[PDB]
Design a protein around this ligand. Sequence first.
Ligand SMILES: [Mg+2]
Ligand SMILES: [Mg+2]
Ligand SMILES: [Mg+2]
Ligand SMILES: [Mg+2]
Ligand SMILES: [Mg+2]
Ligand SMILES: [Mg+2]
Ligand SMILES: [Mg+2]
Ligand SMILES: [Mg+2]
Ligand SMILES: [Mg+2]
Ligand SMILES: [Mg+2]
Ligand SMILES: [Mg+2]
Ligand SMILES: [Mg+2]
Ligand SMILES: [Mg+2]
Ligand SMILES: [Mg+2]
Ligand SMILES: [Mg+2]
Ligand SMILES: [Mg+2]
Ligand SMILES: [Mg+2]
Ligand SMILES: [Mg+2]
Ligand SMILES: [Mg+2]
Ligand SMILES: [Mg+2]
Lengths: 88, 129, 218
Amino acid sequence: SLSTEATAKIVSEFGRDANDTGSTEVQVALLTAQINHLQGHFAEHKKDHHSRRGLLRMVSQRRKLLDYLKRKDVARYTRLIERLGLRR
Amino acid sequence: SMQDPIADMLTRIRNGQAANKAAVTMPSSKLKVAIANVLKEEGFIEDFKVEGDTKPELELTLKYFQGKAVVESIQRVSRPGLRIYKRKDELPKVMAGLGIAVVSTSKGVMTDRAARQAGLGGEIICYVA
Amino acid sequence: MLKAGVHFGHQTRYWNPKMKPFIFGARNKVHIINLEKTVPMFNEALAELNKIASRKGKILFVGTKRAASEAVKDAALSCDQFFVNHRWLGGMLTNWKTVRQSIKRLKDLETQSQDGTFDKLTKKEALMRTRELEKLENSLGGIKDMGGLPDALFVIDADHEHIAIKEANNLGIPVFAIVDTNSDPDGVDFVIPGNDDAIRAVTLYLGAVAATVREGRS
RNA sequence: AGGAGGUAAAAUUCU
RNA sequence: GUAAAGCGCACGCAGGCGGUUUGUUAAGUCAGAUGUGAAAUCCCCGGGCUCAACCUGGGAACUGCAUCUGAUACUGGCAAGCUUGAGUCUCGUAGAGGGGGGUAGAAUUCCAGGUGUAGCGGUGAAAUGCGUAGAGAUCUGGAGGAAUACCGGUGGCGAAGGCGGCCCCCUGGACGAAGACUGACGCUCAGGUGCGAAAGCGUGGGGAGCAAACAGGAUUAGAUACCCUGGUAGUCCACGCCGUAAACGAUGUCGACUUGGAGGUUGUGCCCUUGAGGCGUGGCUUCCGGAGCUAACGCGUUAAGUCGACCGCCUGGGGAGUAC
Ligand SMILES: [Mg+2]
Ligand SMILES: [Mg+2]
Ligand SMILES: [Mg+2]
Ligand SMILES: [Mg+2]
Ligand SMILES: [Mg+2]
Ligand SMILES: [Mg+2]
Ligand SMILES: [Mg+2]
Ligand SMILES: [Mg+2]
Ligand SMILES: [Mg+2]
Ligand SMILES: [Mg+2]
Ligand SMILES: [Mg+2]
Ligand SMILES: [Mg+2]
Ligand SMILES: [Mg+2]
Ligand SMILES: [Mg+2]
Ligand SMILES: [Mg+2]
Ligand SMILES: [Mg+2]
Ligand SMILES: [Mg+2]
Ligand SMILES: [Mg+2]
Ligand SMILES: [Mg+2]
Ligand SMILES: [Mg+2]
């Protein structure tokens, strides 16, 4: 689950202060950040089915809570995906 | 789950009173209180406390007799996946009169005994006997 | 209000969970009991067996298990009633319609341990005849000469008298027993916690209920 | 007083 | 659960369902009012053909629809919140969780020799087979493949299938503790996606053991078997198929609620390390068992007890999980 140090960086700008660790902005950011790095892990290995199963949770959850906010505070999303990368 | 809390309420007290408990702690909602009040107003319990806070906690006491519970039946009728509403003329007589049927209405909650002598209807919530 | 000294509550991790409301025990694991629950369960139990001992009532001492066996064989022979001491015969009450007719085979050959023929015939009839007398007298002083429907009996250990308590409950007869920390109360309308097991402790209840009943109404 | 290892081979059918 | 019936497993769209407080609307819900709901028919009370069937007067009934006006508890919509369901951060815990590469040690087989001599092997008993080029036995040395004794255990881990020597790299999940942030972000899930023992298929590589097929020895009435000497596919690796098992606990997932006893195992908070503690509190887990449930067997806080959300499935044996 990446480094205990890491994510320290990403709570800023996304969050209003450090240890504001629960804004939906950050977890999404935490998830993507892992996922992205973590796609390297499945390049090599790749027949590591089990590890993948955990991945999709990250992806499922990410997407599930990326949909939550779509209902609350409009364009509190259109100010973060492009800020990050993903709307495919 | 926390999906049908009134039914969770009626369960608490059902295998509550079957288990011969003294009373039962419970989360509170502005509804649960209003149904408790009718179990008070009809003596299926002795009385209920809110034991509140910002995280309310309505407790409420037993009520036994000889050796048994006074609630010889307490089931949930209308419910989340199957809502039930009756008209005024057509509403239920639990044990054909003895024992009640608690029923919401444009005027608060209220009982079936009461439901008619008033003259209206609504969501029949549980049958109590 | 101790009255009874070295006594407390005995027996260990067996305990009927539905015997929580009367027991403030723990202690090395042998959980002791609320004693000001037992003595008001006397002053109600030891009490209301004179409302009946005045009604010309007929009790029945019940105590078996090789431990203070014939401790119950005592004033019991007097205490406006009698006892029963070695193994509970399946339904002496319950099936009084018979076994009642084995008092007969006793008191017949009892008044015959001394009266009429008590030696005349062979001395091989010698022991085998008294062997009958020997085998049931330590099994039914139980009746000797009785009279009624023995209403309310008194059992030492509640569930060791497994049978007795149930048989009584099927017949409507009262109850009156003690429960240490493992026997099922449930079927004893007059429940007196304490302890079933101790030669000392048992003779206290025995001595205390032997009193109070003896004063029927003179 | 525990464990261990070795002791029966094949042999159908009944309006 | 065993009678027919829980998808082998999980992830998730639609949909169903949803914590808790204020307002707000009046959709659902409830009350009234008006309209209408043809007549005949059924029903109630009458009338009339000699009675009856039948005809007939009047009523009730037509369980309903629409509109206007209200009521606003419950459901829904809109609004704003709340933190307890839920997730995020922090330091750690144990684990055969998964993937990659590495290496050890014991044995079987084989290759080369040394010594050594007529037997070895195998079975119920045999024989096939192996041995006079020397077997079996033994010693030394060297190949190669597969599997990890002891730990190991009603032990752990995984969603299920399933995972056991040792070593580092990558990675998943579970759980504990304090506090911090989030503020219902949920549960379930037809469709859809993916995972899925063994045998099996493709391409090649690999091949010590084992072993379908096949062969020879027995056995037997027969012996296409069970037993013995051999033995190929395969069992091993790589990459792509296949998608089924008594894939089982024959018991769908989530949450809440109800006496107990022995444990097993892994955390952690407090108190003379004052023990290999004293006192608690979490998660998982094995046996016994109350109430209750059950057709009975049995289940029994890890329910098959008490409830509620949502899904899947059964409707007599066959025909048949067959045909199209
Ligand atoms: Mg035969
Ligand atoms: Mg034949
Ligand atoms: Mg079946
Ligand atoms: Mg299943
Ligand atoms: Mg609701
Ligand atoms: Mg007429
Ligand atoms: Mg009409
Ligand atoms: Mg509302
Ligand atoms: Mg060698
Ligand atoms: Mg080697
Ligand atoms: Mg880890
Ligand atoms: Mg696959
Ligand atoms: Mg295979
Ligand atoms: Mg192949
Ligand atoms: Mg199938
Ligand atoms: Mg299995
Ligand atoms: Mg059991
Ligand atoms: Mg338990
Ligand atoms: Mg269940
Ligand atoms: Mg087919």
